[PDB]
DNA sequence: GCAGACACTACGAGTACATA
DNA sequence: TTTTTATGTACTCGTAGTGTCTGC
């Protein structure tokens, strides 16, 4: 800046009055916040019997169902939502389920298994290899690891993992470690 | 030891056949689709000193183009394969041979039934011509004394009756009558000139073309005719 | 008094209000929209309602119409990354030899593969904010990004009050008596109209167009307010029947509707929802789903109604 | 019969207004737009000597373009269209008359209520321009005495007052006073000099352009404003 | 007024700094970069009569060049900035002042703390080896006794090490050394000879480019070495 | 007369929907 | 108070690669 003095603008008025159309992209991605919800405030009226209109709203019969399903209280609504409502409406869908579910406070976290991403990685190698399902492959992964020939095999399999199999295996960037992982093993 | 640009721009093509390759001690290098509908070899310049199987030969390649043409590839101490130029050193692991498809067995193409030429200007005049109608197979006869192509949209012509497109490729000489039926998507080569070779007995034969980089041969359809 | 626009001949389109005091809003969205106009600067504001025709479009106009700003009226749909790259900059950076505030309407701008562009429109207004001001209109809310919704004044139409309700129905009565003068056409019974406003609204855009249907003959008199009060897919045949438990009916009635299976099943459930036990809601619900789970699975379809009908009739609760 | 490159060139032309064309035997080609905006005729020096309609004069012009200058174009033994070429031959569909949308009889225009000319250059003038100050729309109106096209960019002016472009044609000795706006998405012709009429007669309209090998009809917008 | 080809040569490549440009009455133009690292300045024989502010340059001269170059400018009685040619006329928008970076004067230049002059194959020598070798840094130094200019690459060099290119100008007569780095995306200017002024003092710095034209004014990096 | 400009296509990302 | 099932199909947008013609 050559220019000792001015007030000097934010990056937005330099990305714009430059020109300079990758600034901007960056400025632009610089307001990429995402994943924005409000189904609770649905479930919320099913579990607390408030009001609600979804004539206006948008609806998820599948995540409904699964915020449901986590109580066994609902269970039974939700299971005959699950065999005889999938083809009914979505406003009929939450009227049902307004009626039939118990009133009650009962909001928590999901129950969401945690995975040993090596594991899965394992088994989904285990299964392309061998042209398998995915049981027989961990039962394939026992066998080789109550032998001590899983070293061998892995060590044969480790040409396969390429970097679309690890899109596969988990999204997690992170990825790149179990890829290391994946060449050294011996 | 490195791969001259020809050789990477080959590897390209071979690629388009089959997703890995097995390079094996020689001068030499082969790849067939994994469905063997189609078969290719090549003898190369640049020599194979030690045998190494790639199975993401595209991400291979691309690793290749970024650093320089004299990059030194040979495997690594561990049990992977190096490449190393001036500025910098890669590793790519080396996937067992068992996992990557292999012909196993150079195929002796046996004596032709039939030969014939095609130049660089006809294959892509043919090949815009296809892109142009929508045509997707071929079929080799004899006609009125020449070996002519004609073109074909399988699709909207399931019997081969309407003929979208026609090529002459010289006269036949022969005693023979044949029309052997070649699907378009088998054709992965390169552009160039073509000896080819139709070879065909009983339930069996095949298409060979001789270029000027390498040979590929390919596989007939299931209702070509011929009375050798 | 009222807005005519002689080039329309589609009567919504004729009668459009061109200012702020002319339409018909909840009294504090019609307070904050006078302020704006008064204040002779406008912000960047987002007009949303799900609703249509409650004046979306029409309120930004009018705000225009009111400030004498240098309107750029754009369809959202094609205000694509381009069109925000160069004609929004081309106009924002133009000079101004008149005082005439600059304001960009984007109608309708609510389309979700749009985000990227809307992120850049973001950018552009930390950078020509002071040049020019933005009015979105949208049905989706949710198809305007967060921090576009963050920045603007984001107003919510066709979500009043009772009394407000009250009152803009009394003012749409007016303005259809207006518009029925203007158009030459006789009111022989204002319960027409009334019965028009309460029937469509809060979609003022469809009230006009029912006005010019059921206004053919030129008379609203009482055939037409037998017309307008009248439900020409009503399924009242069937409630009756089921509220009798008249099987011989019932057997009858299924033919008639078994041609248009899914779309009977679904007006036969929202037309029992009201009038049933929350219980017999429940067990409704099941029993239509449940019928409408085997429809292409069992053999005789007329049978099926039928059968839908006899436990509907016998499982019912009517309150 | 050959086709000419002018011949070929015109006959891309009309491809941009109609995606197929009608021609029947003769030297007299035309086409006008689906959509009813602009219209086409045009005598050229090739003859045609068969009635066929193209259903995809694009690929057509295309497939011409993969052959020699010199091409035969007759009418096949099966009922298409046969390219002959000097090694190659290609065989194009003749479409179903009624699946291509063509003029049913040469429109023949008013008596025009203006007229004027159009030099090629000023044509070439407005065109850059168009592109350069992104008007796209125009109006032909009378300036103290002459006529003139006014060039405006209706996206970001919709009220058509800023006006971006001005050209003056001729004087106009008249009476009335017109403001015939035209989109320039509708103005599809090759370059070249034009006697410009203008027809109106209350609520309808057109603006013909006379070349020595063309005419090209173009209807108004909406809004133009008259007094004839 | 017109506008003769070399003063929109020189406008043009003004463009390269600020997509925008402030014009002011006389006969002497100037522009800044938005982030203010370089500038420019120039006295031309051209008389500009009225002030304006223009917000695309570029299509402005393109404008210019799609009319005759007897092309009469002025200001319209709206704002904008009307030419004038035989037959056409164009409305090229006025841009408001807020919307484009200009120098609010022209910018004073110290002392020269050093000079030297560069003759245009040295230049141009330089211009096209940074295309080539992908030089994206450049610095002033001097060795024994010569000032030369090296240049290495900051992307695959963080601590400008490894010189790339070097080129040698003139020779350095005094006492204090002076390794001045400076980024290429500074360096707009047309290709000619250059006398060179530099200036520094505390982290601080600006070198001058003086031609028969125009002169060229580029910051300096943060962490330049002085030792003034 | 050849860089550059203009247009056209191929592909990744994001969204949406039906059915299981 | 939390928050996403697999497969197949369809659409739109942005951009980058690519081919091809042309203006001082
Ligand atoms: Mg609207």
Redesign the interface.
């Known amino acids: ?6 007030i000097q ?2 990056e ?8 300079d ?1 990758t600034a ?2 960056s ?7 995402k994943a ?1 919800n409000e189904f609770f405030e649905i479930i919320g009226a099913i579990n607390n019997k408030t009001k609600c209109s979804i004539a ?1 709203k ?1 609806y998820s019969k599948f995540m409904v169902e699964n915020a449901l399903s986590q109580f066994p209280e609902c269970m039974p609504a939700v299971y ?2 699950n ?7 979505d ?2 869908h939450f ?2 389920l307004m ?2 579910v118990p009133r009650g406070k009962r909001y928590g976290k999901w129950a969401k298994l945690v995975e040993d991403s090596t594991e899965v990685l394992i088994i989904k190698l285990l299964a392309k ?1 061998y042209q398998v399902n995915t049981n027989d492959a961990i039962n394939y992964k026992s066998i080789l690891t109550k032998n001590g020939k899983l070293p061998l095999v892995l ?9 679309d199999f690890l899109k596969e295996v988990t999204k997690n960037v992170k990825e790149q470690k179990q890829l290391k992982k ?2 050294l093993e ?1 | 030891m490195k791969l001259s640009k020809d050789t990477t721009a080959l590897l390209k093509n071979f690629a388009t056949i089959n997703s890995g390759i097995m390079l094996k001690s020689g001068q030499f290098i082969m790849t067939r689709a994994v469905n063997g509908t189609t078969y290719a070899e090549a003898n190369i310049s640049d020599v194979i000193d030690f045998d190494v ?1 790639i ?2 030969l595209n ?1 291979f390649l691309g690793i290749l183009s970024l650093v320089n043409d004299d990059a030194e590839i040979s495997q690594s101490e ?3 394969i190096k490449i190393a130029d001036a500025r910098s050193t890669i ?1 790519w ?4 041979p ?2 990557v498809v292999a012909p196993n067995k150079p195929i002796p193409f046996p004596v032709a039934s039939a030969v014939t030429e095609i130049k660089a200007e006809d294959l892509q005049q043919l090949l815009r011509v296809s892109r142009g109608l929508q045509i997707d197979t071929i079929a080799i006869t004899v006609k009125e004394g020449k070996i002519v192509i004609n073109g074909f949209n399988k699709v909207e012509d399931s019997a081969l009756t309407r003929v979208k497109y026609s090529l002459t490729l010289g006269d036949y000489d022969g005693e023979n009558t044949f029309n052997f039926i070649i699907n378009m998507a088998n054709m992965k080569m390169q552009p160039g000139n073509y000896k080819l070779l139709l070879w065909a007995k009983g339930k069996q034969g095949a298409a060979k073309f001789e270029g000027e980089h390498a040979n590929y041969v390919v596989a007939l359809e299931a209702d070509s005719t011929h009375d050798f | 008094m009222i807005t005519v626009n002689e080039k329309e001949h589609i009567l919504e389109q004729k009668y459009r209000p061109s200012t702020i005091d002319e339409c018909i809003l909840p009294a504090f969205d019609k307070e904050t929209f006078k302020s704006i106009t008064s204040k002779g600067k406008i912000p960047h504001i987002i007009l949303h309602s ?2 249509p025709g409650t004046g979306k479009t029409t309120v930004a106009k009018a705000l225009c119409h009111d400030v004498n700003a240098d309107m750029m009226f754009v369809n959202g749909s094609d205000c694509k990354i381009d069109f925000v ?1 160069g004609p929004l ?1 081309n106009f924002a950076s133009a000079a101004s030899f008149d005082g005439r505030q600059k304001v960009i309407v984007i109608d309708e701008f609510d389309r979700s593969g749009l985000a ?1 562009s809307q ?2 429109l ?3 207004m ?3 904010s002071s040049n020019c001001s933005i009015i979105i209109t949208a049905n989706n809310i ?1 198809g305007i ?3 576009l919704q963050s920045r603007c004044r984001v107003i919510t139409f066709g979500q009043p009050t009772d009394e407000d309700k009250i009152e803009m129905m009394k003012q749409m009565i007016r303005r259809l008596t207006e518009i029925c003068k203007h158009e030459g056409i006789a009111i022989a019974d204002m319960k027409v109209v009334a019965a028009l406003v309460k029937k469509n609204f809060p979609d003022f855009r469809k009230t006009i167009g029912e006005l010019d249907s059921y206004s053919s003959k030129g008379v609203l008199d009482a055939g037409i307010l037998s017309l307008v009060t009248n439900d020409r897919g009503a399924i009242d045949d069937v409630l009756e029947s089921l509220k009798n438990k008249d099987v011989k009916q019932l057997r009858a009635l299924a033919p008639k509707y078994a041609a248009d299976y899914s779309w009977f099943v ?1 007006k036969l ?2 037309e029992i ?1 009201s009038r049933v036990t ?2 017999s ?2 067990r409704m ?2 029993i ?3 019928n ?2 085997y ?1 292409g699975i069992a053999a005789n379809t007329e049978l099926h109604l039928a059968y839908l009908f006899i436990q509907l009739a016998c499982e019912m609760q009517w309150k």
Request: net charge negative; no cysteine.
């Open positions: 800046s050559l220019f000792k003095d001015d603008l934010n937005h008025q330099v990305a714009w009055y430059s020109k159309w901007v992209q400025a632009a991605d610089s307001f990429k916040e924005e206006q948008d005959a939502m065999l005889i409502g999938s083809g009914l409406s406003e009929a009227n049902y009626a039939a290899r060590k044969e399999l480790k040409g396969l993992v390429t970097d994946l060449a011996w | 199987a199975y993401d991400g561990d049990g992977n590793f692991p080396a996937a067992d068992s996992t | 799900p609703s790259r900059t990227e992120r850049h973001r950018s552009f930390e950078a020509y949710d990004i967060k921090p679904g459930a929202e929802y929350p219980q809601i429940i619900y099941e239509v789903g449940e409408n789970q429809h």
